[PDB]
């Protein structure tokens, strides 16, 4: 609001804040003495947060040189006897936490039992050049010598209260430093503020946005410790690779990054379900047992999946030492048995290993039910909710009546527990609000089920009823339609069916007609390079299958020509007692040209008897030459040439993605060459302005933060996120093209 902001610029508020800034710094250092006034210190620092956020809101929407930031630095330099010392309290208190436990000085002979006296660190700090002047004496004075007649108590309590204000003042100085350069009075302060500033470097994310002014402006925020650690886990790290490959490889520009917001949206679900499982620090007592057991599966799912390889390779090593004999050891008397090299442990070992392999496979499928099934259900639930809210896929227009996905989704609409895993439990009530007046709302209640649709007006408005629970409620408190829908989608995806395929040969493997080895082939998909090979065959399935058909027909013409004319030549020797002419029948001849024919160098002519100048000599020699000229050296080379080229293409696509990312900004459309006009310009640019994680962190605390506490720019983003309009992203400018003439 330019009016209110401009009015406050010319008011007496500058005088007020400088008075506050002077008085705040004095009593807080006075109040730190003896720790009696810590409650008041909490209140003062808590109010200082409210002071700084007022200043930040004043700074919102400014020009690079708007004269409000200029007035702000004029206020600040007028407080030059005060803005330094307020920073120095944080400087000392951060630095001592760094210094303690990071040198030779420790507990040592003062008190190993954690009851150190006053002289524990009297002038150990004096060796360091960090503290000088009366500051070291001030720390000694502020050293609460309680029970003089501690490292773990002195520095400990001054971390929780001072966190927020230190981050906020760091934000203010950082934003001011970027907004108005060529202000050397401001440049003095950042040397003093360097320690606290670099401490909050991991927890100061930075975002560029656009909208409402056709201008780029920065945003600053806090990040939780746990979420920063959670994103760095290997599972989410892998999922980043899987998403980022697809959208850059084939996604269009318009649909480039609705998928990206969707990826962020369900990526939140990944940390949530991962946050439930943890290393956490009698019917009633059974629940804790099953919860601990299933969570133990959920953490180490990939590890036991790798264990299946060791079981498979080890059992298949024992599969070699076999023999057969005319009789059992001591005419339809085959006997399969071992040939162990003078050691009897192998035969018991095979039974033991088989039992273990079956068990660990069952562990894989149970853990996969716990872990990834929530995510795929989340995807389908989100698809139905967004499509119903913003479109008429089941109310305005039916589907195409060919896609099974749309038809199978029809059943869950009537159920009451439809948005089980999705966040919002109100989409059913939103669609009737939108498409209520056009269509019959009662019919719409029929489409959604809407159990007690009349009660939906006052389901939880008139009162909040709550009848009690009971035992064995699970046997009659489950929606059968919803569960059937769940099982259908769970069986539809490829990944779960692969585990079931593993299970069928695993259970059948205890029969052990050598079929343990079938696991060993397709288990090796986990290698990326090997997986590309198997994917290459189906990459050109249509073209390949048509080409194999043309092989099947072009050879068939040669067979009928041979059947008419060249019957006498095809004769395998039997010492002149040969009824083995293999072209007295079309099925025999056609199969002969497959087995003995194409899979042989030189074509047919190698195997058939030589034409010894016995009529049709030229007619025969052209037959073999034209056969070899068409089927083998040309057409079979097409069959070879298709997928090998495809394999090269797929490898080139992967390398293309990796090269394309480095040479072009992902979010912003600007190429890397513009940012290559500075040392580390592109690297710093993609590090901070478009980090690709800070945006994901941006969407999180917006969900976590209360609606009343949203700032101006924060609420500006959140409104469009509800409305699903992806315009506020920059898409052409990155705070530098706007201000290229003045300065970055």
How many other CB atoms are found less than 10 A from the CB of residue 542? 8
Binding of a copy of itself by 322 (CB under 8 A): yes
Cα 135 to chain centroid distance, Å, stands at 48
Residue 239 marked ligand-binding: yes
Please identify which residue in the block is written with the tokens 């050293």: 143
Residue 364 marked ligand-binding: no
Q: Residues in the site for Ca ion, rule: CB under 5 A? A: 708
Q: 92 or 667: whose CB is closer to Zn ion?
A: 667
Q: Which of 168, 267, 686, 713 binds ligand ATP (CB under 6 A)?
A: 686
Residues 254-313 that bind a copy of itself (CB under 8 A): 254
With CB under 6 A as the contact rule, which of the stretches 52-60, 148-156, 185-193, 687-695 interacts with ligand ATP? 687-695
Q: Which of 564, 573, 708, 722 binds a copy of itself (CB under 8 A)?
A: 564
Binding of a copy of itself by 320 (CB under 8 A): yes
Q: Is 207 helix (H, G, I), strand (E, B) or coil?
A: strand
667 binds, among a copy of itself, Zn ion, Ca ion, none (CB under 5 to 8 A by kind): Zn ion
662 binds, among Zn ion, Ca ion, ligand ATP, none (CB under 5 to 8 A by kind): ligand ATP
Binding of a copy of itself by 146 (CB under 8 A): no
- Going by C-beta distance under 8 Å and a sequence separation of 6 or more, which residues neighbour residue 691? 205, 206
Residue 201 CB, nearest distance to Zn ion (Å)? 20
Query: With CB under 8 A, what is the number of residues at the site for a copy of itself?
Result: 88
Binding of a copy of itself by 526 (CB under 8 A): no
Q: Which of 105, 666, 721, 728 binds ligand ATP (CB under 6 A)?
A: 666
Residues 604-663 that bind ligand ATP (CB under 6 A): 661-662
**How many Å apart are CA 62 and CA 72, to the nearest integer?**
12
Binding of Zn ion by 171 (CB under 5 A): no
Check residue 473 and report its DSSP letter: G
Binding of a copy of itself by 324 (CB under 8 A): yes
Residue 687 marked ligand-binding: yes
8 Å CB contact between 216 and 734: yes
Distances (CA, A) of 405 to 118, 195, 402, 489, 491: 74, 57, 9, 9, 13
Residue 240 marked ligand-binding: yes
Break-preceding residues in the chain (C–N over 2.5 Å) = 149, 281, 330
What mask, x for binding a copy of itself by CB under 8 A, covers residues 470 to 509? ----------------------------------------
The DSSP code sequence of 62-119 is --TT-SHHHHHHHHHHHTTTTHHHHHHHHHHHHHHHHHTTSSS-SSGGG-TTS---GG
8 Å CB contact between 535 and 650: yes
**How many Å apart are CA 683 and CA 676, to the nearest integer?**
9
**How many Å apart are CA 230 and CA 274, to the nearest integer?**
9
- Going by C-beta distance under 8 Å and a sequence separation of 6 or more, which residues neighbour residue 570? 562, 581, 582, 583, 589, 592, 608, 609
Q: 412 or 667: whose CB is closer to ligand ATP?
A: 667
Query: With CB under 6 A, what is the number of residues at the site for ligand ATP?
Result: 9
Residue 183 CB, nearest distance to Zn ion (Å)? 27
Tokens matching residue 262: 């969707």
Residues 683-742 that bind Zn ion (CB under 5 A): 690
Q: 422 or 682: whose CB is closer to a copy of itself?
A: 682
8 Å CB contact between 433 and 441: no
Binding of ligand ATP by 734 (CB under 6 A): no
Q: 174 or 713: whose CB is closer to Ca ion?
A: 713
Binding of a copy of itself by 338 (CB under 8 A): no
8 Å CB contact between 175 and 59: yes
Residue 689 marked ligand-binding: yes
Residue 163 marked ligand-binding: no
Binding of ligand ATP by 537 (CB under 6 A): no
**How many Å apart are CA 566 and CA 620, to the nearest integer?**
8
Binding of ligand ATP by 692 (CB under 6 A): yes
First to last CA, the chain: 26
Residue 658 CB, nearest distance to ligand ATP (Å)? 8
Residues 62-101 that bind ligand ATP (CB under 6 A): none
How crowded is the C-beta side of 415, counted as CA atoms within 13 Å? 19
Binding of ligand ATP by 665 (CB under 6 A): yes
Residue 689 CB, nearest distance to Zn ion (Å)? 6
Residue 677 marked ligand-binding: no
With CB under 6 A as the contact rule, which of the stretches 48-56, 368-376, 557-565, 683-691 interacts with ligand ATP? 683-691
374 binds, among ligand ATP, a copy of itself, Ca ion, none (CB under 5 to 8 A by kind): none
Residue 60 marked ligand-binding: no
- Going by C-beta distance under 8 Å and a sequence separation of 6 or more, which residues neighbour residue 74? 14
Dihedral (CA of 342, 348, 350, 352) sign: negative
Q: 239 or 421: whose CB is closer to ligand ATP?
A: 239
Residue 323 marked ligand-binding: no
Binding of ligand ATP by 250 (CB under 6 A): no
Residue 678 marked ligand-binding: no
Q: 248 or 544: whose CB is closer to ligand ATP?
A: 248
How crowded is the C-beta side of 668, counted as CA atoms within 13 Å? 26
The DSSP code sequence of 555-579 is HHHHHHHHHHS-TTT----SSS---
**How many Å apart are CA 594 and CA 207, to the nearest integer?**
65
With CB under 8 A as the contact rule, which of the stretches 182-190, 231-239, 286-294, 555-563 interacts with a copy of itself? 555-563
8 Å CB contact between 435 and 395: yes
Binding of ligand ATP by 690 (CB under 6 A): yes
Binding of Zn ion by 667 (CB under 5 A): yes
Residue 664 marked ligand-binding: yes
645 binds, among ligand ATP, Ca ion, a copy of itself, none (CB under 5 to 8 A by kind): a copy of itself
Backbone region of residue 680 per phi and psi (left: phi > 0; alpha: psi in -120 to 50; beta: other values): left
Q: 51 or 155: whose CB is closer to Ca ion?
A: 51
**How many Å apart are CA 628 and CA 440, to the nearest integer?**
73
Binding of Zn ion by 668 (CB under 5 A): yes
**How many Å apart are CA 556 and CA 469, to the nearest integer?**
75
Residue 666 marked ligand-binding: yes
Residue 318 CB, nearest distance to Zn ion (Å)? 56
Q: 597 or 730: whose CB is closer to ligand ATP?
A: 730
Residue 246 CB, nearest distance to ligand ATP (Å)? 15
Binding of a copy of itself by 585 (CB under 8 A): yes
8 Å CB contact between 212 and 60: no
What mask, x for binding a copy of itself by CB under 8 A, covers residues 629 to 668? ----xxxxxxxxx-xxx-xx--------------------
- Beta strands 322-323; 217-221: pairing state: unpaired
| Binding-site residue ranges for caffeine | 423
| Binding-site residue ranges | 237-241, 423, 661-666, 686-692, 708
Q: Contact positions toward ligand ATP, by CB under 6 A?
A: 661-662, 665-667, 686, 690-692
């Amino acid at each position: 609001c330019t009016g209110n902001q401009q009015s406050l610029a010319h008011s007496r508020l500058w005088d007020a804040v400088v008075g506050f800034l002077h008085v705040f710094a004095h009593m807080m250092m006075k109040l730190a003495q003896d720790s009696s006034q810590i409650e008041l210190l909490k209140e003062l620092l808590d109010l200082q947060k409210d002071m700084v956020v007022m200043l930040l809101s004043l700074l919102e929407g400014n020009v690079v040189n708007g004269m409000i930031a200029r007035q702000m630095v004029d206020m600040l330099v007028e407080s030059s006897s005060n803005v330094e010392m307020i920073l120095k309290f944080f400087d000392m208190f951060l630095k001592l936490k760094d210094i303690v436990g990071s040198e030779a000085f420790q507990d040592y002979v003062t008190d190993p039992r954690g009851l150190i006296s006053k002289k524990d660190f009297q002038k150990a700090m004096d060796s360091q050049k960090q503290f000088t002047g009366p500051e070291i004496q001030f720390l000694l004075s502020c050293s609460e010598a309680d029970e003089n007649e501690n490292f773990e108590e002195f520095a400990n309590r001054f971390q929780e209260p001072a966190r927020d204000i230190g981050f906020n003042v760091a934000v203010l100085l950082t934003n001011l430093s970027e907004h108005v350069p060529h202000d050397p009075r401001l440049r003095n302060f950042l040397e003093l503020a360097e320690s606290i500033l670099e401490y909050f470097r991991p927890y100061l994310g930075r975002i560029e946005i656009m909208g409402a002014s056709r201008r780029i402006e920065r945003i600053y925020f806090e990040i939780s410790e746990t979420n920063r650690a959670q994103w760095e886990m290997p599972q989410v790290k892998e999922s980043k690779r899987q998403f980022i490959f697809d959208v850059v490889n084939e996604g269009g520009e318009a649909e480039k990054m609705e998928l990206f917001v969707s990826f962020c949206e369900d990526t939140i679900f990944e940390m949530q379900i991962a946050a439930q499982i943890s290393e956490p620090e009698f019917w009633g007592e059974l629940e804790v047992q099953r919860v601990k057991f299933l969570n133990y599966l959920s953490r180490n799912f990939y590890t036991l999946r790798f264990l299946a390889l060791f079981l498979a390779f080890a059992i298949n090593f024992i599969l070699l030492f076999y023999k057969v004999s005319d009789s059992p050891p001591g005419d339809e008397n085959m006997v399969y048995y071992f040939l162990e090299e003078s050691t009897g442990y192998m035969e018991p070992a095979l039974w033991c290993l088989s039992l273990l392999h079956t068990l660990v496979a069952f562990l894989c499928i149970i853990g996969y039910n716990c872990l990834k099934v929530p995510l795929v259900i989340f995807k389908r639930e989100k698809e139905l909710a967004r499509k119903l809210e913003f479109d008429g896929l089941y109310i305005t227009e039916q589907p195409g009546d060919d896609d099974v996905k749309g038809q199978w989704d029809r059943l869950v609409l009537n159920t009451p527990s439809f948005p089980s895993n999705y966040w919002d439990k109100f989409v059913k009530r939103k669609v009737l609000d939108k498409h209520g007046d056009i269509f019959g709302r009662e019919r719409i209640a029929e489409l959604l089920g809407m159990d007690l649709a009349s009660l939906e007006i006052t389901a939880h408005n008139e009162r909040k009823p709550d009848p009690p629970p009971g035992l064995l409620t699970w046997l009659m408190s489950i929606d059968v339609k919803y569960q059937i829908w769940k099982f259908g989608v769970i069986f539809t995806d490829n990944s779960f069916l692969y585990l079931g395929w593993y299970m069928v040969m695993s259970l059948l493997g205890h029969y052990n007609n050598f079929f343990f080895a079938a696991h060993l082939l397709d288990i090796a998909m986990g290698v990326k390079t090997l997986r590309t090979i198997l994917s290459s065959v189906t990459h050109n399935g249509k073209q390949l299958v048509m080409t194999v058909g043309l092989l099947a027909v072009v050879v068939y013409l040669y067979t009928v020509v041979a059947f008419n004319f060249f019957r006498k030549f095809y004769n395998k020797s039997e010492d002149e007692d040969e009824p083995d002419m293999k072209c007295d029948d079309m099925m025999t001849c056609y199969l002969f040209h497959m087995y003995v024919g194409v899979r042989a160098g030189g074509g047919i002519g190698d195997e058939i008897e030589d034409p010894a100048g016995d009529e049709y000599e030229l007619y025969r020699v052209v037959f073999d030459i034209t056969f070899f000229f068409f089927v083998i050296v040309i057409l079979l080379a097409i069959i070879q040439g298709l997928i090998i080229d495809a394999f090269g293409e797929l490898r080139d696509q992967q390398e293309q993605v990796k090269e394309d990312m480095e040479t072009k900004c992902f979010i912003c459309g600007i190429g890397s060459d513009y940012f290559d006009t500075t040392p580390h310009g592109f690297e710093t640019h993609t590090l901070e302005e478009h980090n690709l994680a800070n945006y994901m962190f941006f969407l999180m605390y917006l969900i976590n933060k209360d609606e009343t506490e949203h700032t101006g720019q924060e609420s500006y983003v959140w409104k469009m996120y509800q409305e699903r309009c992806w315009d506020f992203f920059p898409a052409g400018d990155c705070f530098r093209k706007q201000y290229e003439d003045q300065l970055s």
